[PDB]
């Protein structure tokens, strides 16, 4: 009597974990019996029993639909679930494009600071005034009655580092960055560049507001000259899409565009007009006071002695951007590790700056 109770609890707990797992495997079997689901879109509704579907078990078909399904689900032009031999409409669901996370790679708006390679500050302020203000009020623009921006272009030498200037910006605006890497848009398949861009653009309008950041367009850059269609047909395919969105009845309603270009010369004649690329901003080479600031923000986290004449280094230095000064700072820091001190001197900076200058174009 006594013994039985004691044994009973041990075997019951053991058996329960085993019975439960096993029971799941049985559910899985039930599923292998279950029928496959073919994807279709309805072209049109013929009769209450006949539908046009263009399926992918075979070709175009006229198909049936279950008499268990609602009339309210019949809606004009929708995505449908089809069977794989009965060829009937299992379900209806409302047509949106599929969302893209395989084409939307996420870079968070605050993995950096705009006081890191700040001192590029001034260009940040001009990009902010264009972009940032529409997001806060359309109302202010509206009273006057004036069309606001859609797109902005940054071009020039990537002395900031092309991507860095932009990335710093993304952080400040704190919005929904839909990121584009240009050479994943180009593919070796038919009509994928066209399909991809379009869906991507579609997703932005539902989801609005959103910024589409295009980094280094040069897969869009190329007006041809030998008038090929070698690879060159794809160049034409993509370019045409960019213009088609603008030429449309679409309005980038709260949709923002930022473009990056290394050298500008392959722009279209329709971009000069606003209503695609409104604003095109240049790089600007820092003033010595900016330069001091940039050197100062770099020097500040890292270890040092107790006395550095900042201005002297400012003098030697010219023709650099914030990324370009940063390297000199770190360069000085290597020489200190060599010297085995956490203590720097004026000399390391003088030499560092000259070392970088020579190496340069």
């Amino acid at each position: 009597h006594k013994e039985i109770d004691g044994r009973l609890k041990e075997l019951r707990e053991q058996l329960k974990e085993l019975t439960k797992q096993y029971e799941k495997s049985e559910n899985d079997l039930k599923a292998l019996q279950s029928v496959g689901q073919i994807v279709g879109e309805v072209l049109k509704q013929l009769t209450e029993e006949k539908f046009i579907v263009k399926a992918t078990n075979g070709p175009r078909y006229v198909v049936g639909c279950r008499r268990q399904l609602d009339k309210s689900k019949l809606k004009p032009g929708t995505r449908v679930a089809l069977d794989m031999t009965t060829l009937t409409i299992m379900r209806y669901l409302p047509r949106e494009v599929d969302p893209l996370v395989y084409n939307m790679s996420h870079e968070d708006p605050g993995n950096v600071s705009y006081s890191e390679i700040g001192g590029l500050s001034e260009q940040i302020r001009e990009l902010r005034e264009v972009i940032e203000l529409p997001l806060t009020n359309p109302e202010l623009f509206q009273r006057v009655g004036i069309i606001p921006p859609k797109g902005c272009l940054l071009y020039g030498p990537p002395g900031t580092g092309k991507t860095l200037l932009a990335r710093a910006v993304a952080s400040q605006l704190d919005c929904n960055f839909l990121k584009v890497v240009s050479s994943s848009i180009v593919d070796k398949y038919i009509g994928e560049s066209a399909r991809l861009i379009r869906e991507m653009f579609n997703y932005a309008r539902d989801h609005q507001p959103c910024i589409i950041f295009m980094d280094e367009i040069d897969a869009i850059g190329g007006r041809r000259f030998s008038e090929g269609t070698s690879a060159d047909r794809e160049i034409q395919r993509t370019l045409m899409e960019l213009l088609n969105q603008m030429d449309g009845f679409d309005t980038l309603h709260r949709v923002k565009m930022i473009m990056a270009t290394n050298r500008p010369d392959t722009l279209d004649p329709a971009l000069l007009r606003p209503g695609r690329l409104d604003r095109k901003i240049h790089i600007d080479l820092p003033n010595e006071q900016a330069r001091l600031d940039i050197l100062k923000i770099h020097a500040g986290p890292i270890t040092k002695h107790g006395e550095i004449d900042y201005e002297a280094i400012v003098k030697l230095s010219d023709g650099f951007n914030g990324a370009d000064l940063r390297n000199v700072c770190t360069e000085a820091g290597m020489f200190a590790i060599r010297a085995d001190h956490d203590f720097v001197v004026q000399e390391d900076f003088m030499k560092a700056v000259r070392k970088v200058a020579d190496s340069k174009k």
């Binding site: 009597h1 039985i4 044994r7 009973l8 075997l11 058996l15 085993l18 019975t19 096993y22 029971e23 079997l29 292998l32 689901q37 994807v39 279709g40 263009k54 992918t56 175009r60 929708t78 995505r79 669901l93 949106e96 494009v97 599929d98 395989y102 993995n111 990537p158 580092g161 092309k162 050479s183 994943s184 180009v186 070796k188 038919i190 994928e192 980094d215 280094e216 040069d218 190329g222 007006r223 000259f225 030998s226 690879a231 060159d232 160049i235 290394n262 050298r263 392959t266 986290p301 890292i302 270890t303 990324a323 370009d324 940063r326 390297n327 820091g333 590790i337 956490d342 340069k360 174009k361």
Partner: protein, 316 residues
């Protein structure tokens, strides 16, 4: 009171056996579909709400492409897309938007998860797990060695020093000078010494007939590198990966440019890794194709020193 106890111990033993029989049955079932021919497929979209999507069309005349895919998709390699509802036979969170899955061509369900990465694992990626070179056995190369040792090897180890300073390491190195000096020999000696994997990439190899293929190849190279950590990616060329033209008409040569740009952005896109070390070399003496302004780009400069008579003697 006595009775109920003793029957419950017999009940529990009987229940285990019926459930035990069920699992047995499932095991054979799954196994049969594995024996090849078998369909591997690629999951494009993870998602598990909003079914239905579309593939294929009718005909007549006038040509514009279209393709779609949603809920969860697998695209099998006859180029067919399939809608499945998830199973616990493998977990969907463990799966990704871009994963290879093993599918049971019956109900079209994911029996299993396969490893990481798709398509080519580079069409000619040479791995040298331990090079046969040592630099302690060749003297008179000495000047170049002193600079090389100091450049690569020192950040990994000496990390503790770096951390206290607060400066970060490099990531790329440039070597320039007359080819065929046995510049490469020293690169192979450092790799042997350090305990990184040496990955040899040749620049015309990235170039393909196929359109956009190279960028995938480089991205993959980078990804394989991440897994291997540490690694040396040795890039031969800065001529077939060091041109991009500044010519106005340059469009035809777009392929070459796209790949080069891809490397530079792949470097600029994020903030460094201490899993990769990259060494770049020229193969024709000196070009200008900017790729050296940041240190997430290249920043270290190694020069070949002109021949010293003393050095030649030592080699002899």
């Amino acid at each position: 009171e006595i009775k109920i106890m003793k029957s419950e111990v017999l009940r529990v033993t009987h229940e285990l056996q019926a459930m035990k029989d069920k699992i047995k049955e499932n095991s054979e079932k799954i196994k049969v579909n594995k024996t090849l021919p078998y369909l591997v497929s690629n999951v494009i979209e993870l998602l598990d709400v909003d079914p239905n999507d579309q593939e294929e069309d009718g005909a007549n005349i006038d040509l514009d492409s279209q393709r779609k895919g949603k809920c969860a998709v697998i695209k099998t390699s006859t180029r067919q897309t399939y809608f499945l509802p998830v199973i616990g036979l493998v977990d969907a969170e463990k799966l990704k938007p871009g994963d290879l899955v093993g599918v049971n061509k019956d109900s079209y369900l994911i029996l299993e998860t396969l490893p990481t990465e798709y398509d080519s694992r580079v069409k000619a990626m040479e791995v040298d797990e331990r090079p046969t070179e040592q630099y302690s056995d060749i003297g008179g190369l000495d000047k170049q060695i002193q600079e090389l040792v100091e450049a690569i090897v020192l950040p990994m180890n000496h990390k503790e020093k770096f951390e206290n300073l607060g400066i970060q390491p490099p990531k790329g190195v440039l070597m320039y000078g007359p080819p065929g000096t046995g510049k490469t020999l020293l690169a192979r000696a450092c790799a042997a010494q350090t305990k990184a994997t040496f990955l040899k990439l040749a620049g015309p190899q990235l170039v393909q007939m196929f359109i956009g293929d190279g960028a995938k190849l480089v991205r993959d190279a980078f990804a394989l590198a991440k897994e291997k950590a540490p690694s040396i990616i040795f890039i031969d060329e800065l001529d077939a990966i060091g041109t991009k033209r500044f010519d106005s008409e340059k469009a035809g040569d777009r392929e070459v440019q796209r790949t080069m740009l891809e490397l530079l952005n792949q470097l600029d896109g994020f903030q460094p890794n201490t899993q990769v070390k990259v060494i770049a070399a020229t193969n024709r003496v000196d070009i200008l194709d900017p790729a050296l302004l940041r240190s997430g780009r290249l920043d270290r400069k190694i020069e070949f020193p002109m021949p010293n008579e003393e050095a030649r003697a030592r080699i002899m």
